[PDB]
Ligand binder design. Structure first.
Ligand SMILES: [Fe+2]
Ligand SMILES: [Fe+2]
Ligand SMILES: [Fe+2]
Ligand SMILES: [Fe+2]
Lengths: 299, 299, 299, 299
């Protein structure tokens, strides 16, 4: 995998669709110097600073970062990245981790308000029905019960102690062996009710600009209105969960997954409970916003 | 009463309009095996599983169950069932009870969110003004203060210890000796205000597709706007409560009433307080949703 | 003052506009017998019972009560009543008091939900800035910050111990010596903002059907938008409060004022604090609803 | 600076745009006599009294006050006042301070509901990230996340003990050396999202009636939608904060700043924490409402 200014990029061991982007130690060192004056708390109060820290990182990569992130995330054949910075790999560096993740996100779009934290990101600690270790968290898309589309999901590993399992699960729609069967079903186009934990109605599948399937699915929030929709959804669920195309991805401390939420589903594998278990995560979810040469009216 | 695959059906001792459906021990055994992998908690999070457990039970009855439930519930001459499964008859089996009731409901429609429990069903324990033993709960219809129609009411007996009385009361509109007198009154068609414990306005009576009376009445939530509406409603109330057509139905542990809420009213008889009284109930309320050969437009 | 069936009516000592209606001991005795089966709690849950207890009282007065209440309350020259029943005059009889007040109100209209109690009436106990004894409560109309009109105000004295002062104050617009001066001012017709403790806009004065002034005024909830409206309202306030037409009315235990809120203002005089002071009140507020021979369309 | 009836007016030491208005001891004495009958609590309940106390003060200044306040606040070349009354200069006089500030505000407009206090003004005590002494509070305009425009900001110093720093910062748009550069940028006219701590959309700049720049900006509530808006806002922020036109104004106890919020920004300098620090402030924010000879339709 290739050499860019300030970082390297290589395919993952799980899939060529998922690429691993690592910022050099020198880029990392300089980034942290140049953003030291804004603590995370400044980023939380002034959203424009989220874009500024973005600019600082991209400028350190000779402006090669932003176009690469976008080309990868929007490329149907790929659409997923695992990102890290050499030197940021310990829980003591959580703030620095948030700054990094924030900078990358705000080069490609904007992170949405998170109702769990009341901020643009959320950090969660896991320590020893839905909260359950031996439970796989089923593959899904985020953002299914609001009108606005969530284009990206960012999941960062902040701490990991005494943890067995709990890999991120991923499925690219084009690796799913049953796509054609479910996409070509009439109920693939049936608007269904999705309800928060005001209701919205949208189909479970849609298409991208070129007519290729995309999904907006989660088992917990979809609300089949009758026996027809119900049985079909229970079959679709089994067809996703038993897929041979599912990826299992370890996310080491300091690294984060950044994926296109339209044609990747994500989930979490089970893990072993242990009295001294500690896992800390950070999430952001947002929309893409980027410049292209395209048409406009007026002056 | 007749033999179907997996269950038997017979008229009740109270009325030929109310039929008693009992699943055989073998059906019950197999149902519980085949649904063991989804605990009630799974059904609460993923509504499609509610329809799946429905399918499993109907499949065990050679697909004779679903059409029989619908034919009975929609039949004006009947419209009520008391349902049980041989082998499920103790409070220790409450989860199994919920699964059964859920499976039957989601063959005929879908159960609505219950604001008391925050789930698609609600379980309540009674132990020693509105909470009162010596108080009869007056005959009524459910769902009178929302715009959407509640088609069915399901009441299951989960536990019963040291209980005297407290039978379910039922009245089929066609057994009510004063129907003609109240239905033909001009105020039968007067939209009246109904208010939750946003207000809705609907008449106290309406008609089914064939022009036969249906009701949407409850004394607590109807809000007569003046002396005219008030006196008439107080007279209608007395005329319902003193009706000779009222049924009194014991609901033993493991059994549930499932009734058409348009032309049956329901209520509860008084019961004797006792220091060691324990009654546990489960309710679901929902709409009908079923396939028929009927017209549609477009392709 | 005159003799009707079941009650007597006479002018007050304060004004010929305020009439005193007293139910005979026999009417009272029979009313209480005939309504004993519905405790106040029944009236709170089933609003139609509020109209029924109305019917029972009017029937006991040979149907002379309802037309007299309406003729008095709607008569511009009067519009106020002080009502009592011989034999109901002690705090121990508070429930009976509520039943009586309820019966009278629901012969002339319907009492509105009271947000302080969550019921159709509210009972308040006073015992030892706004809560202040040496503070007169300024003359006002109720219902000024909702779109719907409040036609009547009912204030009943439930208990009174160790109380000096605290009479009800009343002003009939036609006894107000400054009416013409304020009514003919351009700001009398200026819609002004009124805001709850969504905002509404209405003028401080309006007219009845015959073009005679009515008011919708309270100093606490009117929200002058500028110096013009502000100064004028402060002058109007002084002109109401220093009026020579103000009535001061003692309301003995068991008695209640029932007034037309369009052309009477009400308030409360100061009272002496005392360690063993106890005053208990009940209020209802509502709209008029009554039959008359008038035009309608269709069949 | 000039002599008016009841007060004097002189330019500040910081700028000729900011004028210092001091009521004479005699005006002050008479004002306090003539408003003694309405405690602050009366002003809080009856908003018309806020305008009345205004009238009393202006009347004491031969009606020269109101026109001078308006001429100053609306004058583009000025638009800011520092106001005090000889004899009101101690925390023990806080109520008198509120009355004074209220009287002045309600000669020029009306103060809006303050959600922090639930009243038309708010008092705050400061004693020993956003709450931070060594933090400058950045220059901003108030009222940026509601549809209605806030025309004035009033900040009064009620108490000051053991305080180093914490001056009010001010910037008049016409003293800002980078105005032309940012105002002439296309994003100056881009409606941007502003969100409360329902969202509103307005540009960061607008124009007054003569086409001169005005601002509606605060770093905390503006929500850049993408990298373009974000970077530009971070640059605008630096350009405001490092401006050589910024004023630093000490506000002694008893004095208050009253500024035009359209073409002045305000903020606060850092201050030294001290164990026995006590600063008490009062704020009001409102709209202008005043008489002028202008056109109207109808009669
Ligand atoms: Fe997710
Ligand atoms: Fe019910
Ligand atoms: Fe009142
Ligand atoms: Fe401010």
């Amino acid at each position: 995998g290739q050499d860019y200014s300030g970082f390297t990029l290589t395919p993952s061991a799980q899939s060529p669709r998922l690429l691993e982007l690592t910022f050099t130690e020198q880029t990392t060192k300089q980034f942290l110097e140049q953003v030291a004056e804004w603590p995370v708390q400044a980023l939380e109060y002034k959203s424009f600073l989220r874009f500024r820290v973005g600019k600082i990182l991209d400028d350190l990569c000779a402006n090669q970062l932003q176009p690469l992130l976008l080309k990868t995330l929007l490329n149907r054949a790929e659409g997923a990245l695992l990102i890290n910075a050499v030197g940021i790999d310990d829980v003591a560096q959580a703030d620095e981790m948030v700054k990094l993740a924030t900078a990358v996100a705000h080069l490609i779009g904007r992170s949405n308000f998170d109702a769990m934290s009341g901020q643009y990101y959320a950090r969660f600690v896991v320590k020893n029905y839905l909260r359950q270790p031996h439970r796989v968290m089923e593959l899904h898309n985020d953002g299914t019960y609001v009108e606005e589309i969530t284009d990206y999901v960012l999941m960062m590993k902040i701490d990991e102690q005494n943890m067995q399992g709990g890999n991120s699960l991923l499925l690219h729609l084009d690796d799913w062996e049953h796509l054609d069967h479910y996409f070509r079903h009439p109920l693939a186009r049936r608007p269904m009710r999705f309800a928060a934990p005001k209701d919205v109605f949208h189909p479970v599948f849609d298409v991208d600009q070129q007519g290729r399937p995309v999904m907006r699915y989660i088992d917990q929030f979809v609300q089949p209105k009758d026996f027809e929709e119900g049985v079909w959804l229970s079959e679709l669920s089994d067809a996703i969960e038993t897929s041979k195309g599912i990826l299992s991805v370890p996310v080491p401390v300091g690294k984060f997954l950044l994926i296109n939420n339209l044609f990747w589903l994500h989930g979490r594998d089970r893990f072993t409970p242990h009295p001294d278990l500690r896992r800390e995560l950070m999430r952001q979810r947002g929309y893409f916003a980027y410049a292209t040469h395209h048409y406009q009216t007026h002056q």
